[PDB]
Amino acid sequence: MEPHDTLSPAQVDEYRKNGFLVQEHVFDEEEIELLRAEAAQEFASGGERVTVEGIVRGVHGCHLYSEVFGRLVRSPRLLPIARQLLRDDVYVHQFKINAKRAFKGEVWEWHQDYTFWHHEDGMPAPRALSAAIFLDEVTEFNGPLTFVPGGHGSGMIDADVKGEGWANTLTASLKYSLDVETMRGLIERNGMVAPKGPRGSVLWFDANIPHSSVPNISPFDRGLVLITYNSVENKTDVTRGTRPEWLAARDFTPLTALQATSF
Amino acid sequence: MEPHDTLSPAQVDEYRKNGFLVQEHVFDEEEIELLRAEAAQEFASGGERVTVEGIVRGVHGCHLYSEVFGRLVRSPRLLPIARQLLRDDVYVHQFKINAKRAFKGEVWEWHQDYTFWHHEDGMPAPRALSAAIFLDEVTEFNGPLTFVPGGHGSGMIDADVKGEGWANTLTASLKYSLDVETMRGLIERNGMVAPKGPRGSVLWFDANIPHSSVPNISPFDRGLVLITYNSVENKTDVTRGTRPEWLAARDFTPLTALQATSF
Ligand SMILES: O=C(O)[C@@H]1C[C@@H](O)CN1
Ligand SMILES: O=C(O)[C@@H]1C[C@@H](O)CN1
């Protein structure tokens, strides 16, 4: 293992100011292909953990079931940056894989992840973030995650609620959405940015940053592996929890990094 | 009237190479507001010439019914550039207004306009182009027209056909679409570009350039006034024509430019 990676002070400042940051080329092509193959296995075998638009859209919880993905979350490319940004030991709250195949895709309601994790899972504060690993180059045209830079600084934003239980936390129509109303001011104030990057990049983003994405009109897929790390001190209150382990983790053991072994 | 506008030789070369070109800030804000108000009147009063996604999407043929838009097509900002690019006297084949309101919008099938005009209207060759006037700033996020640069150089491309008559020439689901198949090669060869620009710009594009667009996830509208000029020598063969005058013109009188008057 290479000496644990960390973000420069400029990178940190950029992440805190904007609410997101791209590191290019974290993983190589061969690494990405391993992850892609495992994702395909999880989409085939994940059963109730899968979501379909038909056509698989998402699979959840894979680090609990896949040895590859259980290792990935402890990678020296990821874990030390999460600990650096959250200023704590960390654990995985949620793991999901979101594909947008060429010429497919949904419009995804503008939203803040933390609203779901607070209300559905009992997350007490937004001291969490996600790492989105680019299984394919992310361009203007294959439905990139789209943010309001600085939009997290509001904290959590009162939001239109739709549905019962949690079924529609993972779908087209999201349970907690930001209406056109609130969005206009956000965007007049702050603008919109769809970070781009090559295959193998990682996109870090704040649990409270507003985000959205459109359809992929490209002939190329947009597969993302999203790992949500949470602060151990910020562990969710499992007595207010309403979802299964494969959406909202309950094992709060602090993660340690993978070490090099001969196998 | 200012001495008729024309494109520089670099601008021409760029248009011919890419198949599109943006001129920024052709019209001013006050001019644009006049056009916006007239568009709103046409959407209210156009009847069978209107198209709805509900919610108005398009209105067609307005230069035949609106004095403002009848003048616009003869504007010294537009007509002389069309004559320059088509190397002929010109007339209006088609006029349409396409709005994408904030948070609304459709995915539009990749396609070439000339395929419709050849097969539905009897246009003998692709010696035509469109001028898209930006009634609002066009950004990454409000569903900009998206092209394959150089994609017109194929000429017309064999295309999936769907429907009877012409009803679905103006809709979500288009009669002549380019499938994922053909699109992949195009885009590997040539890439994708979504020209941007401020309100009052004009986007010129070739009758044969492939194009597509996605939904507007912005809190801002994307209104476009699209004037399709055709070469008089390239006049459509009215004996193969299948659509009304307000989609496919039959008066081939060469246009002359507006001159300054006291009223
Ligand atoms: O339900 C959740 O937990 C996640 C948060 C957002 O990505 C939407 N779905
Ligand atoms: O039907 C037509 O004539 C136009 C050409 C494309 O803009 C699609 N509709």
TrEMBL record, chains A, B:
2-oxoglutarate 2 binds at K96, H111, S213. Transmembrane segments: none annotated. InterPro entries: Phytyl_CoA_dOase-like. 2-oxoglutarate 1 binds at K96, N98, K100, T169, S213, R222. Keywords: Dioxygenase, Metal-binding, Oxidoreductase. This is Phytanoyl-CoA dioxygenase. 2-oxoglutarate 3 binds at N98, K100, S213, R222. Signal peptide: none annotated.
